[PDB]
Amino acid sequence: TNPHVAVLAFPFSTHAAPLLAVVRRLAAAAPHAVFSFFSTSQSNASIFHTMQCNIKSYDISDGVPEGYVFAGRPQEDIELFTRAAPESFRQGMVMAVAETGRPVSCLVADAFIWFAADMAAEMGVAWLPFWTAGPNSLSTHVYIDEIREKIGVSGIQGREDELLNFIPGMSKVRFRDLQEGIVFGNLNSLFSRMLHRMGQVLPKATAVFINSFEELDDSLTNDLKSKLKTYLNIGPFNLITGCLQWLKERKPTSVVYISFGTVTTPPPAEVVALSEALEASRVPFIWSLRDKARVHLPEGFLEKTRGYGMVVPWAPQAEVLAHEAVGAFVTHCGWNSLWESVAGGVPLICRPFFGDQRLNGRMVEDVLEIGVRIEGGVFTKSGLMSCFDQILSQEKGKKLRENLRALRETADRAVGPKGSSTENFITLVDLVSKPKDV
Ligand SMILES: O=c1ccn([C@@H]2O[C@H](COP(=O)(O)OP(=O)(O)O)[C@@H](O)[C@H]2O)c(=O)[nH]1
Numbered sequence: 024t025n026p027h028v029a030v031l032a033f034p035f036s037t038h039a040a041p042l043l044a045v046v047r048r049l050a051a052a053a054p055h056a057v058f059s060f061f062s063t064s065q066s067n068a069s070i071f072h073t074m075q076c077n078i079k080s081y082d083i084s085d086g087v088p089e090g091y092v093f094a095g096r097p098q099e100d101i102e103l104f105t106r107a108a109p110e111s112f113r114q115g116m117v118m119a120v121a122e123t124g125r126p127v128s129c130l131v132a133d134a135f136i137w138f139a140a141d142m143a144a145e146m147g148v149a150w151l152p153f154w155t156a157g158p159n160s161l162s163t164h165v166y167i168d169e170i171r172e173k174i175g176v177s178g179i180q181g182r183e184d185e186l187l188n189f190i191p192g193m194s195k196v197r198f199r200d201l202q203e204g205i206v207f208g209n210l211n212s213l214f215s216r217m218l219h220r221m222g223q224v225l226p227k228a229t230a231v232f233i234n235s236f237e238e239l240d241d242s243l244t245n246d247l248k249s250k251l252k253t254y255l256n257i258g259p260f261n262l263i264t265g266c267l268q269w270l271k272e273r274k275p276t277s278v279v280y281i282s283f284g285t286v287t288t289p290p291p292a293e294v295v296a297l298s299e300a301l302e303a304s305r306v307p308f309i310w311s312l313r314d315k316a317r318v319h320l321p322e323g324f325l326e327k328t329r330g331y332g333m334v335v336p337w338a339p340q341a342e343v344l345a346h347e348a349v350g351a352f353v354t355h356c357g358w359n360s361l362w363e364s365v366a367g368g369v370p371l372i373c374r375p376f377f378g379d380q381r382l383n384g385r386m387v388e389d390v391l392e393i394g395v396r397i398e399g400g401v402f403t404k405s406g407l408m409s410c411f412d413q414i415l416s417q418e419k420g421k422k423l424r425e426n427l428r429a430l431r432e433t434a435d436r437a438v439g440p441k442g443s444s445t446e447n448f449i450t451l452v453d454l455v456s457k458p459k460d461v
């Protein structure tokens with residue numbers, strides 16, 4: 024039969040949306056192929072809220088048993104989803120095959136679904152994992168065993184600012200920048216082991232693809248092409264594809280936008296510190312903050328800032344960052360947020376917490392020079408007031424904006440006609456268009 028592409032999303036943080044974004048592009052480019060998109064019901068309802076006729080979503084189990092009482096651990100939801108997922112995805116695919124009358128001919132999946140490799144082997148189909156983050160984090164996972172050998176697994180105390188310069192393209196990353204589960208944090212957690220296994224199996228993939236462009240870092244691109252069978256940069260996606268009315272009335276490059284993505288919130292003390300910096304400078308602002316976290320705001324803050332700032336549970340982030348009024352972005356250093364700031368030409372103020380956030384912060388500050396660090400890695404009133412001054416009012420911000428304009432032009436060319444990402448996407452279309460082997 025003609026192709027039937029199974030797509031397995033990771034239904035946490037901002038993983039499922041960019042995967043749907045590529046599927047949309049793939050479905051338009053391969054109109055004879057049908058696509059079956061698998062995530063949790065919560066995840067699907069959110070991301071599917073104009074859809075190519077050849078895509079249908081399917082709700083699979085979140086892995087939570089009927090009468091389950093949460094222990095309240097971190098990564099509990101992820102753990103439950105992950106343990107059930109081999110079976111959940113299988114049953115979802117059974118259903119899609121029965122509905123379409125087409126066997127699965129290709130398996131596209133978030134790289135986090137590492138057992139997809141085994142599912143693809145058992146099915147007799149190609150495995151096409153999507154790395155949802157940066158090539159920097161892709162590279163440390165692929166090098167997991169080598170990194171653990173060089174550094175050791177008994178701690179990095181006294182070595183935090185040592186350099187990972189034994190890895191190509193990674194000369195500027197310090198030991199401390201590494202994600203939990205490489206050399207520190209709980210190396211025995213399900214999540215650490217999932218990532219360890221992923222790292223070992225990615226070199227076996229038919230192709231690994233990523234929301235980035237080759238020319239971001241030539242050496243890193245070349246190194247990864249040598250560690251993986253096929254490595255395909257096909258982004259940045261966002262260059263390919265009452266907040267605004269409020270912004271309309273503000274001066275150019277004057278507004279600070281604050282957000283920590285979908286799964287991060289600063290501790291209450293840093294919430295206080297940021298509110299004090301905003302208030303003391305009287306800088307115009309839009310702060311995307313969880314409604315539940317509003318309880319941590321100092322008494323009086325909302326009332327004192329009412330004339331010049333908004334605190335909202337959700338903003339139209341991409342469009343805010345593309346508005347001429349915005350002059351700085353206080354961020355957790357998530358990958359999707361980063362590229363949205365680049366599209367808008369807005370300099371970053373980085374406060375990384377976990378995962379790949381420290382790697383992205385290092386890239387922003389030391390590699391691309393498109394943003395700054397807060398002194399000491401935590402929010403303080405004075406530290407943030409200084410960053411705002413640097414970016415909005417001083418020569419530093421002029422330079423950062425220049426750097427951003429230059430970076431975005433390179434990125435635009437990667438996704439233009441004859442761009443490296445445009446060419447890589449043709450390659451991926453050809454891979455997903457292949458019918459199943461006989
Ligand atoms: O108020 C908000 C906060 C976040 N986002 C979007 O959520 C995504 C955040 O993804 P990222 O990789 O930056 O961080 P994550 O949420 O995965 O930790 C981005 O597309 C943002 O534009 C948004 O639209 N409005």
Ligand SMILES: O=c1c(O)c(-c2ccc(O)c(O)c2)oc2cc(O)cc(O)c12
Pocket residue numbers: 035036037097098156160161202203204218286377378379
């Ligand atoms: O959604 C998550 C995520 O993407 C990562 C992540 C991303 C890139 C990496 O390289 C990495 O090691 C981890 O970590 C997480 C850790 C959590 O506790 C919860 C999450 O939801 C994520």
